[PDB]
Design a protein around this ligand. Structure first.
Ligand code: FAD
Ligand code: PEV
Ligand code: HEM
Ligand code: UQ1
Ligand code: SF4
Ligand code: F3S
Ligand code: FES
Lengths: 239, 614, 136, 101
């Protein structure tokens, strides 16, 4: 009764429409016949109004980071961002900032993933003949070191908010990939911690971070990529 | 249709159609062995529904207390309701220790005990001393984020090998010639190009089909794609009718509240604030089979004990657990509960209701992952075709899956597919010359759907079946209604020709990717509703009111000495092999016998069917 | 991989794909404007120092001569106590933020609730110091 | 080698150095402390500007040129600072004077 209709300005761009220029389409969504988060408005516009709105979605609980976008000026997983029930505003749904768009809201993340691959995100042991035979021992105090660090969902919300990744994302790895590098470095079972550091000894891979700390705020998971990057720098100095 | 779609042909040693836990384990196995593998995934690997899997892997590693893998075997067998293959159950429970060890040796951050070993917990259906004992501690958990850490460890660990991922490619059909499989034909979602990844061994690890139901804990991408590729290739499915409805799913969102929380001490309470898990499970109590607990929770509201404002859900109490335990082992459900239900686990209880969670059925495989045919009453192996994970039915779960056995399923049988491939084939085997128009029917269907002017939208045929299955194939079933459902589903299937799509582009046409996922969901729904209507017994998760008894070749409640062995055609202890004529949409149902002999009869003898009372 | 990154740039540079908006759409977090103003105050301070050493090398005369040159055209007690503030506020701001960034380098104070107390502190000490400095 | 972590560290040392070398200039002015302050500010500024350049001048061709013109602006700023120090009142006195009116 008395429907509440919120406006949603959403960044559109169609690759197949010749000469299409990025624009903003508005969709008044009724807030009573939809869920509470922003991904519920988007899935409603796609199932009931405009069946061409393209975005990535998969879990709808914020555990996988496919719905990462720029809602109201902040990189936040759309499945966990509540709709502002103040109906005098127009939500500004935008793709991740400074990233090539495949269609409307879907950014080209393949460089983000290639950079993740480049840091070697796997356990490296000097003696790998005993792999799979015995439970590598690790203390509860040495296992606590990886808290807040292994829970990254690789949603790029942090990397695409970093002004240094905007400018030099060709060579800078960004807060997410660097945080993961750190994670690996301080895994008590890894045996390449003085060789994972060596790989960052160029003026760009790690040393484009200047502690803007714009990655720790945007992290939808409440992690802290910039403190990780700081620990990495203190490890690169005090070997 | 034709040259409006140029086809890019690839040749690999092995193709894995999936990048969940099972698909990643299998791709990693093949690539590590040496095979030129290719993972075709429609989601970035770490995007797979595996991530939604709070709750460790079961494994009989004896850290907390002396444990044996034979007790885990027994537990499994019993919880399956004797409709599981005790040879695949034997293999899995025997390889679970070494599988979780290899997983910890890859970097998976398992929670550690005071001695520096993997911290295990207690779930529903586990025991010690072949039941006679009490609750056991075998669940090797990564601090309530086990599926996330599994997926990330396996993916990053496959980056170490030449695993050529095809990320965001939709697999449309298998390339079957002369009864064997030569790979898959896939759709690149990014540019709309058709790709034919030819191989010598296909592993189908596509997950379940939970989106066949209105309310599900499952992702938007659980659409039964591999099960339907198998249906559209002339191969059967198996035990589709059995659908686990996890009891502890959020009332509104349908999110997961980890059966671990219960295993930690959490309790289920009705409107009267009583632990009804005693009247039903005097020993198992809260930690019981996810079929007994779900139906009991249904049989609390059915009789009017719902503690909801609308009286349609029960509470799960966790505030009686210390805050340190709540946040040290269950850090994820705290967030989930707060960010969705707004419930603070440390203060007020969480609203919970049974929603569709796991599909015990799927593609019939053996204990090696090899997909099975059924020709003249014999089990014939489809050459070059493997299945693993939720998509497969090796019947290690039978009628009911035990908690934490599904992640174990993924790792152990991804390993099984990889090991079987590396023992049956050599890296470099020349791919046979496939015909020059293989997979044309898939491209012609993709075209007929991209330019599908019609009447009924694709979102409406979904909601239609989703609510016809939520009403007619729910926890409790009855012929008089399972036939109304069969009718409704057959009719909605017929209406798959009156479909209307709006997006006519090629780049990221998700209206096409979703009409294709609806063609797969309607094939998994036809079979599940018909196998459920036909199964005139009550076993495991299939509970029928008009036949409230588990029929077996004997009356195992009574002594089986003077009993006459009921013929295979009468008793219902047999797997439902389902087929669908994809043109007419008619489902023919065959029946296969359950494999009882274990891998080594001397090692662990067959567990005789008994009265599965918890 | 290198090949994957070369292929991402070779494909996206040469394509028609647009680059999503960033600085216009992105809200300005305080510390982001506090870092852009630390880069601006640094370039400014460096420009000053540099043109003062060039002047020193080329400009003819003495500093006391140019000083009395500006003194001659008397300005008053207000333009002086404002030009000083406008000439030292960049230096103070910068120096304080510098100490902030050195604290951050030792990996301290890098929790969201703290970057805003640090912000406020820095800006306060900026003003407070600037004034005090130009009240000498 | 460690030529990026050695840089990062050398810049933090110079920073803290300048941080201490500025107030001590007020406490006890000296001509040698003028010369050390000149070298401090010219190395801090050269490295800072270096960073700016590295961030904004994309292209290895143009970058090297910009850094050479920056090492020249710096190699002359330091020259004028030392000249002034030796032929005028020095940075401490100069400042004090311009801060007398
Ligand atoms: C909310 C939730 C919580 C769970 N918690 C637990 C737990 O605590 N413990 C436990 O043991 N189990 C748990 N499970 C169950 C278990 O984790 C899943 O059954 C398991 O992750 C499925 O593995 P899979 O790889 O077969 O499927 P998925 O992990 O879902 O992977 C399927 C893959 O197939 C791909 N795919 C599908 N269709 C296509 C297509 N047409 N073309 C190309 N690629 C395709 C997808 O992109 C994906 O990569 C949970 C399940 C859910 C839903
Ligand atoms: C490199 C040359 C730069 C020239 C700087 C002049 C103009 C810029 C203004 C900012 C610097 C001056 C403010 C600092 C407070 C000065 C207080 C003062 O006069 O006291 C001492 C100031 O002189 C010093 O010794 C220290 C001088 C520090 C100057 C450092 C300058 C470095 C960078 C300046 C660039 C600013 C450019 C800004 C552009 C936006 C003098 O000693 P005293 O007679 O008071 O008593 C001491 C013994 N009894
Ligand atoms: C007074 C004490 C000072 C401290 C503690 C200090 C500290 C810093 C720090 C920590 C940085 C950041 C370096 C990087 O980005 O990683 C910086 C940048 C910079 N500083 Fe200073 N500084 C001081 C004074 C000065 C002075 C007097 C000048 C003038 C020449 C100056 C010029 C610069 C420049 C040009 C930059 C580069 C801008 C940028 O990189 O952000 N600094 N300073
Ligand atoms: C603090 O981080 C940031 C910068 O750091 C120097 C910027 O330059 C910019 C962009 C501004 C200019 C003048 C290039 C932004 C938006 C920013 O957040
Ligand atoms: S670190 Fe935080 S934001 Fe950055 S990628 Fe991982 S989760 Fe997403
Ligand atoms: S915001 Fe960017 S500049 Fe560094 S501190 Fe985080 S990576
Ligand atoms: S949909 Fe998976 S993170 Fe929002």
């Amino acid at each position: 009764t008395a429907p509440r209709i919120k406006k949603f300005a959403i960044y559109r761009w169609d690759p197949d429409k010749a000469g299409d220029k990025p624009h903003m389409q508005t969709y008044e969504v009724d807030l009573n016949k939809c869920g509470p988060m922003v991904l519920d408005a988007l899935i409603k516009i796609k199932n009931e109004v405009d069946s061409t709105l393209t975005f990535r979605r998969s879990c709808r609980e914020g555990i996988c980071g496919s719905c990462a976008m720029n809602i109201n000026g902040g990189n936040t997983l759309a499945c966990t961002r509540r709709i502002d029930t103040n109906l005098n505003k127009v939500s500004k749904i935008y793709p991740l900032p400074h990233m090539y768009v495949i269609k409307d809201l879907v950014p080209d993340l393949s460089n983000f993933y290639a950079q993740y691959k480049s840091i070697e995100p796997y356990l490296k042991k000097k003696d790998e003949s005993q792999e799979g035979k015995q439970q590598y021992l690790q203390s509860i105090e040495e296992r606590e070191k990886l808290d807040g660090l292994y829970e990254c969902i690789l949603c790029a919300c942090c990397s695409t908010s970093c002004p240094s990744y905007w400018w030099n994302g060709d060579k800078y790895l960004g807060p997410a990939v660097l945080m993961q590098a750190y994670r690996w470095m301080i895994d008590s079972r890894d045996d390449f911690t003085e060789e994972r550091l060596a790989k960052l000894q160029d003026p760009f891979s790690l040393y484009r971070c200047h502690t803007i700390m714009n990655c720790t705020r945007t992290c939808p998971k409440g992690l802290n990529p910039g403190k990780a990057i700081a620990e990495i720098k203190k490890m690169m100095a005090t070997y | 249709i034709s040259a409006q779609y140029p086809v890019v042909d690839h040749e690999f040693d092995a193709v894995v159609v999936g990048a969940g836990g099972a698909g990643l384990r299998a791709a990693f196995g093949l690539s590590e062995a040496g095979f030129n593998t290719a993972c075709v995934t429609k989601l970035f690997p770490t995007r797979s529904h595996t991530v939604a899997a709070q709750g460790g892997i079961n494994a009989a590693l004896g850290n907390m207390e002396e444990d044996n893998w034979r007790w885990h075997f027994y537990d499994t067998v019993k919880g399956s309701d004797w409709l599981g293959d005790q040879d695949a159950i034997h293999y899995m429970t025997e390889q679970a220790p070494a599988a979780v060890v290899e997983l910890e040796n890859y970097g998976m951050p398992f929670s550690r005990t005071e001695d520096g070993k993997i911290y295990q917990r207690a779930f529903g259906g586990q025991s010690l001393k072949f039941g006679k004992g009490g609750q056991a501690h075998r669940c090797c958990c990564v601090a309530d984020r086990t599926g996330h850490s599994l997926l990330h460890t396996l993916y990053g660990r496959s980056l170490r090998y030449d695993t050529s991922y095809f990320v965001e490619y939709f697999a449309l059909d298998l390339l079957m010639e002369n009864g064997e499989c030569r790979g898959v034909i896939a759709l690149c979602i990014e540019d709309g190009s058709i790709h034919r990844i030819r191989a010598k061994n296909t592993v189908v690890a596509t997950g379940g089909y939970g989106r066949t139901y209105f309310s599900c804990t499952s992702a938007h991408t659980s659409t039964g794609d591999g099960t339907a590729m198998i249906t559209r290739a002339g191969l059967p499915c198996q035990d589709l009718e059995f659908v686990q409805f996890h009891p502890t799913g959020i009332y509104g969102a349908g999110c997961l509240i980890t059966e671990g929380c219960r295993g930690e001490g959490g309790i289920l309470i009705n409107s009267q604030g009583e632990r009804f898990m005693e009247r039903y499970a005097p020993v198992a109590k809260d930690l019981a089979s996810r079929d007994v607990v779900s139906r009991s929770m249904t049989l609390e509201i059915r009789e009017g004990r719902g503690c909801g404002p609308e009286k349609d859900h029960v509470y799960l109490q966790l505030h009686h657990l210390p805050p340190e335990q709540l946040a040290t082992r269950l850090p994820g459900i705290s967030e989930t509960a707060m960010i969705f239900a707004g419930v603070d686990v440390t203060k007020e209880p969480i609203p919970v209701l049974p929603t569709v969670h796991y599909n015990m059925g799927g593609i019939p495989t053996n204990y090696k992952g090899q997909v099975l045919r059924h020709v003249n009453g014999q089990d014939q192996i489809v050459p070059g075709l493997y299945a693993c994970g939720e998509a497969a039915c090796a019947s290690v779960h039978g009628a009911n899956r035990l908690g934490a056995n599904s992640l174990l399923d993924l790792v152990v049988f991804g390993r099984a597919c990889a090991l079987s491939i590396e023992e049956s084939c050599r890296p470099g085997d020349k791919v046979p010359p496939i015909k020059p128009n293989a997979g044309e029917e898939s491209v012609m269907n993709l075209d007929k759907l991209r330019f599908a002017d019609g009447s009924i939208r694709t979102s409406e045929l979904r909601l239609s079946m989703q609510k016809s299955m939520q009403n007619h194939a729910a926890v409790f079933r009855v012929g008089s209604v399972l036939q109304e459902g069969c009718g409704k589903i057959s009719k909605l299937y017929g209406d798959l020709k009156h479909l209307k799509t709006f997006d006519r582009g090629m780049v990221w046409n998700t209206d096409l990717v979703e009409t294709l996922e609806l063609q797969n969901l309607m094939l998994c729904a036809l079979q599940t509703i018909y196998g459920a209507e036909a199964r005139k017994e009550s076993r495991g998760a299939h509970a029928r009111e008009d036949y409230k008894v588990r029929i077996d070749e004997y009356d195992y409640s009574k002594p089986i000495q003077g009993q006459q062995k009921k013929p295979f055609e009468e008793h219902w202890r047999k797997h439902t092999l389902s087929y669908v004529d994809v043109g007419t949409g008619k489902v023919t149902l065959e029946y296969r016998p359950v494999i009882d002999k274990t891998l080594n009869e001397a090692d662990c003898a067959t567990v005789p069917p008994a009265i599965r009372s918890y | 991989a290198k090949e994957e990154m070369e292929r991402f740039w070779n494909k996206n540079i040469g394509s028609n794909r647009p680059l999503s908006p960033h600085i216009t759409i992105y809200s300005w977090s305080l510390p982001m404007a506090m870092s852009i103003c630390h880069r601006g105050t640094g370039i400014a301070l460096s420009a000053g120092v540099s043109l003062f050493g060039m002047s020193a090398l080329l400009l003819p005369g003495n500093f006391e001569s140019y000083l009395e040159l500006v003194k001659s055209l008397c300005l008053g007690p207000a333009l002086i106590h404002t030009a000083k503030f406008a000439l030292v506020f960049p230096l103070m701001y910068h120096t304080w933020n510098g100490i902030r960034h050195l604290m951050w380098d030792l990996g301290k104070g890098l929790k969201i609730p703290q970057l805003y107390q640090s912000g406020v502190v820095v800006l306060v000490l900026t003003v407070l110091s600037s004034m005090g400095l130009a009240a000498m | 080698s460690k030529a990026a972590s050695l840089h990062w560290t050398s810049e933090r040392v110079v920073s803290v150095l300048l941080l201490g070398l500025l107030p001590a200039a007020y406490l006890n002015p000296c001509s040698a402390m003028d010369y050390s302050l000149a070298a401090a500010l010219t190395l801090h500024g050269h490295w800072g500007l270096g960073q700016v350049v590295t961030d904004y001048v994309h292209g290895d061709a143009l970058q090297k040129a910009a850094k050479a013109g920056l090492l020249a602006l710096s190699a002359l700023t330091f020259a004028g600072l030392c000249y002034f120090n030796y032929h005028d009142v020095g940075i401490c006195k100069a400042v004090a004077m311009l801060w007398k009116l």
